[PDB]
Amino acid sequence: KELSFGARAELPRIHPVASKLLRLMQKKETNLCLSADVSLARELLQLADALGPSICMLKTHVDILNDFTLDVMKELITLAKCHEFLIFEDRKFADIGNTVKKQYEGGIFKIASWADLVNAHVVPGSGVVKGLQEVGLPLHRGCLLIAEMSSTGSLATGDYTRAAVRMAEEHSEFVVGFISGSRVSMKPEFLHLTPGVQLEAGGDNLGQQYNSPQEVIGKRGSDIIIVGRGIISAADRLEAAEMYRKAAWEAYLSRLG
Amino acid sequence: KELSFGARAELPRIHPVASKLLRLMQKKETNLCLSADVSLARELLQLADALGPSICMLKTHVDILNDFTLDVMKELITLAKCHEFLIFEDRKFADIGNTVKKQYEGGIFKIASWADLVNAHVVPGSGVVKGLQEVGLPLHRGCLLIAEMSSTGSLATGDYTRAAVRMAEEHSEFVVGFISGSRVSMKPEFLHLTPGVQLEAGGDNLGQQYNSPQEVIGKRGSDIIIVGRGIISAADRLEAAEMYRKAAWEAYLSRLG
């Protein structure tokens, strides 16, 4: 039997970051993660401010941001606190442990100083998680493992997926869930976030495949939808965000009771 | 029957970037790629200048560089031309096509404006290559696909590896080879670069596993060794570079005739 996000937030094994996330989801009635896939800091900040009330999470690709500075991240954190959402840097760490720990803590981006969550590919094996955790645990951060991908020809299937789940179970002090197309783990302490989501059928020219919030949350058992162009490419991004929020929320409520 | 690097450089299907690489290798008698895994721009530049004559390639993690600017990359290019080596940004693109193309061209790093080669994970499926190629082909750049990893518990094995090779064959206009632990493709137009290389047996604390140049080039059929700490952590990095160059070169010559 399924538990609400409010109840999952209180589970004995829950990670502090997941708990915070689960409580604001319940509070705000949102399971929408905005993929803020933009290249200007002013658009990112105007989107985070305007859409902040509608989202549980803001997902960034900081290496696209033409005018990144740490001060932009300071501003984004202010918005994140004001409106109550997490910040998720979609960096997809996918190197050896020794390398990823420097990528996570250092360089120009100082990802770990502002990102509540990051993600990693499990291909390098479990050293990728061990490496990130040496920076991440002291900073009280969490990590998502990419168990499945939305894109055409994805190799993240079968035993690869089983292996991402195992890696997650075995690093539960730092790993809080998955990027996947569906529920991959039966343990309610793990979050499932699903990208490749649009209201209408379709894809793009570069291998992206879309499914609807009702399919993803309702039929496939995921918890959160990640949506980029479905919102960002709309004229009214607030209204688009609201239409995604309400679809994912109701899909959730319907799966629950 | 094996061909020299000079002869491979002239093969009908050879990529222009591979050709340039193969010719300077032969010219300089080096198949060593330095992994310049440092956080200061001045150390990177002093290493590239001092070690430039000993290497065919300089591999960077620009997102570790505490004081990155594009001007540092201008300086590195000057050294690369002066001493004749390629620059390889080890970014491990591992997202959907639409995302990777922005990561490759834009943001603060403008990777494609200075990097002769980049690499990518094949997990997202072939859209990761299609996405990079839309930036990379106009800029006359090449890409390496990660077919195998050196680290403990790596999932890049079996059919995953077979799939990286297929992806490579089918994008030969942009993909010039592989990061692997061994020869994975029988086609001499593809380069094999192998990391996880040290003179002495061992590893690190975060899942890295080492093999020697003779094992890697000589027994396993690779073309180029990538070496980080084996050189960078030595007192005399020039002498260390020379000891790696001469091991990899002779291993090559011995496999040849």
Ligand SMILES: O=c1cc(O)n([C@@H]2O[C@H](COP(=O)(O)O)[C@@H](O)[C@H]2O)c(=O)[nH]1
């Ligand atoms: O399997 C995956 C994993 C991802 O992170 N993503 C990311 O999620 C977002 C999807 O964006 P969009 O809704 O514009 O297609 C992109 O930022 C992409 O990098 C994905 O599309 N598929």
Ligand SMILES: O=c1cc(O)n([C@@H]2O[C@H](COP(=O)(O)O)[C@@H](O)[C@H]2O)c(=O)[nH]1
């Ligand atoms: O399978 C792989 C693929 C890599 O790119 N690398 C990279 O190669 C270098 C190995 O460095 P070192 O020689 O210090 O262990 C690192 O920069 C690492 O990110 C690797 O070690 N193993």
